[PDB]
């Protein structure tokens, strides 16, 4: 009898394979697939009861092919917001519930493992994939991402952080080299993955393209084997990004199991490797076994075959709440928001107010049916959109598309007098969207073009000379230049990329039914010259392309800003709500073991209801080593507190989370001396509620991630 998976001893199953069958497994494949589209697939050796599993593209939604031929019903996918909206809530329970509705699509439509979600650190705001990365803080990113995996892996469908390490730049990423000392990698760029591995236990882990100090990330042992499998306790499968990696031999020996998607040349190098006698069978057998442990739990092996009954109607409701709570109000002046009931005619400005953005382009882009543009979001909330300005913007785009991403429609064609003749208030929509492959340009992606500035001030002064107010809707995919033009507009809402349910979420924020309780996952600087990692990042308008150095140490997006008090447009975690909250006493019981457990009760006295993102920042003197000013060591988003309401919330900080890695001893450490704790609104708070503590083997590791030496 042929031994098969789930019955014969696992060891006896690998025996029955030959070198032909083994290499077929570790190198997957790709009209021609079981599910239409949806990116890669994994091979199956059928005689041993092994199916051919499927993997698709997220992370902003399951990506499958629309209806084509020989099918009865079209198949589409709910366009959820981007991973920055998820991070902008700070509500891991909320993100849990989205991965629930996200994973339901993954299972019902015939997928086994979705490529979700990348949780790399936001290092420089000029990165193309900043929308699919979560935050600049590892603790916020690593924790929110862990709950995202949980919601998708409670449906029994796999999850892969889309890029394992050091994919913070998108210039020559195929041959880019990151160079930095061990502590910079472990505390910062390895931390968000450390959390998700320990708790979420995702099935697969996708390695990145670039190198580390000289050796490829997908072909590095200490990274994939010592740090991943042996320190964090990873049990699943390690794959590569498609067509990623040089030597197929080093990938296998580094502990990288599966090669994706699969080419003819890979097999030939792996075929020659074992026959000549370089790649050992134990190495190949180790990689195959991780794939066997991987396939066992997939519903393809249990044969819950695709029924294609998603119920897309019910899942869409969840996204509207995730985007709404994930929207952050950047400035409210004279309490102009929420819009009062008197506003009924509204003038709509911005090309992207009618071609409204939902999510980033390229691989993250998903198949949606309808896009709730802003033009329609104000039509479900009852408001009347201006007939003339809607006529000017709808008809302008064809001419501009005809001749040589799109320059803003100038105010010359639009009737400036008619805007104050019928409409009560005006809205602006600044639309930016950077693709994954091409990095952000200074001219338009960060700074605003002059086609935007002359619409900002031109609309502002003309309306402010009518007593009226103007609100800017930042439909952007990341940080932009703000300080120059921010003063004019009275209200500025930051919608990020709200997915398909776009205008409805902006409508609820404007009408006042919902309360934007979103906080910033990143720090917006004044201008681009404030960024410390700017010196260590290329200019998309040879260093920082072929090789890259990390001289900023532990301090990244906001750690540098706090220790050195750099001016910034909006600090980390800054956010506003219509009601104003008040805090409870800062008293934390000191655990007998040594860890820290903080309690607090927020007090709300506001007309409308809202939610409070309690944030705990802990400081460090740094007598042993240079230390960041204040690193978040816990957070808490409360319930929907009513007028005159108050609920206690819990925030715990383990003693391990009060540790920091040391280069010399190749180990983590907690520095002794007088230490400081805080509970604040935003990261850059002058006056937070402090409770001082006296901090007295946390983790001993081998010297991984060093710098090469001849």
DSSP secondary structure letters along 544-595: TTTEEE--STT--SSHHHHHHT--EEE-TT--B-SS-EE----EEEE-SSS-
647: region left, alpha or beta (phi > 0 left; psi from -120 to 50 alpha):
beta
Cβ contacts of residue 214 below 8 Å, gap of 6+?
177, 179, 707, 708
Bridge pairing between strands 491-494 and 470-475: parallel
Q: Which residues of 660-685 are buried (b: 16+ CB within 10 A; e: fewer)?
A: bbbeeeebbbbbeeebbbbbbbbbbb
Give the residue among 28, 115, 126, 156 at the shortest CA–CA distance from 366: 115
Residue 57 CB burial class (10 angstroms; 0-12, 13-18, ≥19) = buried
Q: Report CA 418 to chain centroid distance, whole Å.
A: 42
Q: Is 169:176 a contact under the CB 8 Å cutoff?
A: yes
CATH class of 327-513: alpha beta
Other CB atoms within 10 Å distance of the CB of residue 378: 23
Q: Could you say which DSSP state residue 162 is in?
A: S
Give the C-alpha distances (Å, rounded to integers) separating 392 from 348, 416, 458, 503: 11, 12, 17, 20
What string of DSSP letters covers 312-346?
HHHHHHHHHHHHHHT-EEEEE-TT-PSPPTT--EE
Q: Does domain 579-695 sit in CATH 3.90.1150.10? A: no
Q: Give the C-alpha separation, 52 to 681, whole Å.
A: 50
- Residue that has been written with the tokens 């794939």 in this structure: 291
Angle at 643 between CA 637 and CA 649, to 5 degrees: 30
SS3 labels along 464-530: HCCCCCEEEEEECCCCCCCCCCCCCCCEEEECCCCCCCHHHHHHHHHHCCCCCCCCCCCCEECCHHH
State the Cα torsion 450-452-455-460 to the nearest 10°.
Answer: -110
Contacts made by residues 527-532, CB under 8 angstroms, sequence distance 24+? 527/481, 527/483, 527/484, 528/126, 528/442, 528/446, 528/447, 528/481, 530/561, 530/566, 530/567, 530/568, 531/124, 531/125, 532/560
Give the residues across from 600 on adjacent strands.
649
Report which of 319, 332, 317, 345 is spatially closest to residue 472, judged by C-alpha positions: 332
Residue of 241, 386, 424, 685 marked catalytic:
241
Selected from 3.40.50.1100, 3.40.1350.10, 1.10.10.60, 3.20.20.300, the CATH number assigned to the domain covering 10-302 reads: 3.20.20.300
**Residue 525 · residue 484 · CB < 8 Å:** no
Residue 282 backbone dihedrals phi, psi, to 5 degrees: -55, -40
Tokens at 573, concatenated: 């975690």
Phi and psi torsions of 186, nearest 5°: -65, -55
Cis peptide bond N-terminal to 117, omega within 30: yes
C-alpha distance from residue 199 to each of 89, 150, 196, 501, 552 (Å): 20, 9, 5, 31, 29
CA 10 to chain centre: 37
> What are the CA-CA distances from residue 1 to residues 7, 288, 376, 548 (Å)?
12, 21, 64, 55
CA distance 441 to 539: 8
Method underlying the structure: X-ray
> How many other C-beta atoms lie within 10 A of the C-beta of residue 100?
16
From CA 473, how far away is CA 427, in angstroms rounded?
7
- In angstroms, what is the C-alpha Rg of the chain? 26
Of 209, 207, 226, the C-alpha closest to 161 is 207
**Residue position matching structure tokens 């009060």:** 658
Asked if 57 contacts 364 with a C-beta cutoff of 8 angstroms, the reply is yes
Q: What are phi and psi of 368, to 5 degrees?
A: -110, 155
| Tokens (6 digits) for 597 | 């457990």
Count of alpha carbons within 13 angstroms of residue 564, beta-carbon side: 15
**To 5 degrees, how large is the angle CA 589–CA 594–CA 598?**
30
How far is it, in rounded angstroms, from Cα 533 to Cα 168?
11
SS3 29: strand
Is 20 known to be catalytic?
A: no
For residues 223 and 227, give the distance between their C-alpha atoms in angstroms, rounded to a whole number. 5
Residues 118, 83: Cα–Cα separation, whole Å: 8
Rounded to 5 degrees, what are φ and ψ at 104?
Answer: -60, -45
User: Angle 239-140-175 (CA atoms, 0-180°, nearest 5)?
Assistant: 40
| Domain positions in the chain | 10-302, 327-513, 579-695
Resolution for the entry shown, Å:
4.0
Q: Give the separation between CA 17 and CA 45, rounded to whole angstroms.
A: 9
Spatial distance between the Cα atoms of 574 and 560, rounded to a whole number of angstroms: 17
Q: For residues 393 and 414, what is the distance between their CA atoms, to the nearest angstrom?
A: 8
Give the strand order in the sheet containing 55-57.
Answer: 55-57, 113-115, 158-159
| Nearest to 492, CA basis, from 686, 384, 333 | 333
By CB neighbour count within 10 A (0-12 exposed, 13-18 middle, 19+ buried), where does 648 fall?
A: exposed
Q: Are 408 and 452 in contact (CB under 8 A)?
A: yes
């Amino acid at each position: 009898q042929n031994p098969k998976l789930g019955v014969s001893p696992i060891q006896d199953v690998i025996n029955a394979m030959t070198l032909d069958e083994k290499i077929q497994l570790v190198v997957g494949s790709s009209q021609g697939q079981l599910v239409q589209g949806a990116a890669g697939q994994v091979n199956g050796i059928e005689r041993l009861g092994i199916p051919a599993t499927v993997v698709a593209d997220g992370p902003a939604g399951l990506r499958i092919d629309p209806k084509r031929k020989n099918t009865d019903k079209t198949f589409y996918c709910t366009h959820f917001p981007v991973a920055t909206v998820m991070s902008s809530t700070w509500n891991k329970d909320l993100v849990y519930s989205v991965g629930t509705s996200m994973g339901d699509e993954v299972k019902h439509y015939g997928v086994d493992v979705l490529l979700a979600p990348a949780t790399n650190i936001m290092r420089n705001p000029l990165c193309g994939r900043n929308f699919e990365y979560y935050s600049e803080d590892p603790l916020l990113a690593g924790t929110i991402c862990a709950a995202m995996v949980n919601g998708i892996e409670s449906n029994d469908v796999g999850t892969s952080l889309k890029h394992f390490a050091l994919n913070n730049q998108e210039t020559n990423r195929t041959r880019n080299n990151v160079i930095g000392n061990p502590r910079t990698f472990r505390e910062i760029y390895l931390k968000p993955f450390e959390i998700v591995i320990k708790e979420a236990q995702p099935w697969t882990v996708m390695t990145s393209y670039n190198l580390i100090n000289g050796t490829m990330s997908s072909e590095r042992c200490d990274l994939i084997t010592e740090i991943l499998r042996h320190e964090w306790g990873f049990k699943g499968m390690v794959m590569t990004d498609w067509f990623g990696g040089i030597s197929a031999a080093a990938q296998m020996e580094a502990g990288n199991d599966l090669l994706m998607p699969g080419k003819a040349d890979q097999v030939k190098e792996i075929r020659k490797a074992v026959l000549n006698g370089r790649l050992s069978m134990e190495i190949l057998d180790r990689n195959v076994r991780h794939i066997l442990e991987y396939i066992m739990q997939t519903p393809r092996f249990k044969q819950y075959v695709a029924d294609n009954n998603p119920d897309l109607k019910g899942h869409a409701l969840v996204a509207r709440n995730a985007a709404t709570e994930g929207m952050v109000l950047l400035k409210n002046n004279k309490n102009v928001l929420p819009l009062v009931q008197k506003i009924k005619n509204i003038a709509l400005f911005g090309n992207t107010s009618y071609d409204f953005i939902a999510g980033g382009t390229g691989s993250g882009n998903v198949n949606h049916a309808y896009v709730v543009s802003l033009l329609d979001g104000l039509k479900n909330a009852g408001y009347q959109v201006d007939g003339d300005i809607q006529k000017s913007y709808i008809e302008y785009a064809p001419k501009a598309k005809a001749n040589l991403f799109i320059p803003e429609m100038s105010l010359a064609e639009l009737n400036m007098s008619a805007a104050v003749k019928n409409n009560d208030l005006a809205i602006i929509t600044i639309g930016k969207s950077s693709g994954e492959f091409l990095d952000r340009k200074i001219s338009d992606s960060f700074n605003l073009t002059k086609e935007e500035k002359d619409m900002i001030s031109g609309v502002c002064n003309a309306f402010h000379k009518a007593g009226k107010k103007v609100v800017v809707i930042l439909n952007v995919c990341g940080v932009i230049e703000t300080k120059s033009w921010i003063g004019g507009p009275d209200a500025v809402l930051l919608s990020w990329l709200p997915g398909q349910e776009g205008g409805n979420c902006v409508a609820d924020i404007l009408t006042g039914k919902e309360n934007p309780s979103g906080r910033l996952p990143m720090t917006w600087p004044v201008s681009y010259n404030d960024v410390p990692s700017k010196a260590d990042f290329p200019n998309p308008e040879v260093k920082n392309v072929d090789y890259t150095e990390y001289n900023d140490g532990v301090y990244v997006g906001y750690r540098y800003y706090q220790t050195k008090n750099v001016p910034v447009s909006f600090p980390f975690g800054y956010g506003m709500s219509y009601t104003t909250f008040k805090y409870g006493k800062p008293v934390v019981t000191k655990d007998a073991q040594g860890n820290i457990k903080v309690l607090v009760t927020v007090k709300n006295a506001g007309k409308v209801a809202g939610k409070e993102v309690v944030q705990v920042y802990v400081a460090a003197p740094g007598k042993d080593m240079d230390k960041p000013a204040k690193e978040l060591r816990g957070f808490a988003k409360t319930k929907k507190l009513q007028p005159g309401e108050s609920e206690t919330v819990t925030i715990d900080i383990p003693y391990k989370n009060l540790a920091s890695f040391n280069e010399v001893d190749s180990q983590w450490q907690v520095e002794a001396g007088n230490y400081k704790v805080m509970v604040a609104k935003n990261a850059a708070d002058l006056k937070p509620l402090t409770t001082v503590i006296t901090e007295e083997v946390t983790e001993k590791v081998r010297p991984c991630l060093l710098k090469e030496v001849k």
